[PDB]
Amino acid sequence: CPDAVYTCRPGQTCCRGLHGYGCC
Numbered sequence: 001c002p003d004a005v006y007t008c009r010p011g012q013t014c015c016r017g018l019h020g021y022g023c024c
Contacts, residue, residue, distance in 0.1 A: 001014035001021050001023070002021055006023075008023030008024070009023055012024040
């Protein structure tokens with residue numbers, strides 16, 4: 001995620017992708 005305040009689903013975290021951001 002872009003911001004440092006984004007809660008992701010249980011077991012994953014804010015990940016950075018080539019097409020864009022998103023939780024792992």
